[PDB]
Amino acid sequence: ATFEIVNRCSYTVWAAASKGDAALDAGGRQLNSGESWTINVEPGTNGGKIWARTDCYFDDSGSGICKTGDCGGLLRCKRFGRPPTTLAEFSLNQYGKDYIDISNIKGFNVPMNFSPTTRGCRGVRCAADIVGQCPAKLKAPGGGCNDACTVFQTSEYCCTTGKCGPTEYSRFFKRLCPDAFSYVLDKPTTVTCPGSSNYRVTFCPTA
Template sequence: MKFVARSGRSDKHSLRFHLSMLCKKRSPRRRPCHKKLAPRLLLSLSLFTNGTSTTVIPTNTTANVTAEFASNLTPIRLIVANDCAESIWPGILTQNGAGPGTGGFELTPGASRLMFVSSNWAGRVWGRTNCSFSSDGSEFGTSNGLDGNATACLTGDCVGKLNCTLAGRAPATVAEFTLQGGSTDNQTFYDISLVDGYNLPMAIIYYPSPNTTWIPPNLTNCACIASAGYLSSSPYSSPTAPLDSASYLNTNSTYPMPFEPIQTNNTVQAWCPVALQVPATNPVAAGDNATIISNPDNGNPLTPHRAPFQPCLSPCAVTKNPADCCTGPYNSPDVCKPGLYSRSAKRVCPDAYSFAYDDRTSTFVVPYETAGAGWEVRFCPRGRSTDILRTFGEEVQAVGAGTGLSLEGWARVRSWAYIEQRETGWTGAGMVVRGSAWTAVVGLVVVMV
């Protein structure tokens, strides 16, 4: 996916909207105000012993380490990596705990940056594209943003600043983290979110501490790839799949990864509703369902009348309508329901948040660790979107609860046949998570506002 040249939009995007998106209460899970974060490494060494995996986190990256280097207050490694063909400018927002000491920086193709955060950190990481900053990053860029005003980046912009102090402007694919949550503060929650739209493929990789090496990587390492050029052919999770699938997302032949099996490089150019493409090709009125569904191109393969895929805005970013934003009278999972954008996003990225109350099929949980663990946020991974929560929902529940897997669970996470059976039955419409106790697991996080 080549980052496109800028073009103008007439929609206004105010500081007030930044703040409302940041502080929106979206979930009975009770997470911190809005969302979370992640890391990357250049090289990793995986050791396999008796069916378990131990990942050694490297310290040699291509960018400088932040000032809080491995202090007692910041024992958790956070790595951000760029596998894109062009430079990106990651944005980082800390919502709780000690952050990495920076809110943004440039990351050239193939580069990564090692940082450290506290074990109670909560925040979010996203990538900005097509940016232009002053030499010290302190002033607005010189190019026009989506609303015609002076902003620094086409997507994910932080009010024109290199060092982000607010949530990035839509559209942006976001990694969200709450490292210490749950009713007894003994769980870590994380996810990939498309609630603010989509601009870049993303993966989150968990590097366990010595206490959590028993957790299989095919229950923790998720990816969302909804851009042509980064999508590998399907089937990707089978013994005859391409060789790179054997190590993609730090998985291995012992623990095969379940992937979304249907999308192609043609279909991922057409998943974004036409009215939400960047730049938008036709106007949108309030109410995503009424306006966008009427467009005959929605959900269809690329046609001569449809522009090639660009970053995709969320309905909320375009209409500001409470029904699209799950705000006001719609601030409840009983009232706010997925629309066309959410359903389309879920088809291409089954493990990603597609709207504000998409908790059951989008939230990953691991036991909380005070030190030794690490996280990677990787932009533009090449492979396929994962389908972990639909396939192994019960097993992810058990990991998050700290109870370990049952014998049947261990058998399932090691079974190619089980994954292929689940993939064969996938219709692309709606997600079903096995295990009725999931709500009890994700309903324990406490929101800090």
């Protein structure tokens, strides 16, 4: 499947694409404002994510740090990123269908739009100014708005027991973006698309 990853933000992002134990395509690439990086994700990829990293430094080997979404210091992500990360999440060719979402379970750093570029299904977006509105106790000094699991490490916020309900904090994310996951047991905002659909993810889709 083809994912086109567009940076509409006014600032540079370092895009990332991983399934947790490996890269998807090259794993990470810088996107200046307006740039696009096109990737190929293997059919059948289950549990893939794309995200943006902010305020990154990399040496000539591709080693360094990012203030949000750092994946073990690598330009070319093998692993998931350090919260806070707005996540575009997808499992493809799962019994004939593709499943996509955006999640704020791991916080929010950059606004995003996740949309098919083929027919049969609708996109989802989390565009609101979550960083600007972020509860004081959730604010990430490095930038972004952490998830309460990250901050507070409780069974309730992190759904450790598979039993958890909404919280003031999940509800904050949910108010700003009702079409993204806010906690582990949120009513699902997963969209079913045709198997082998294609997609575009856009950072800062409105601004």
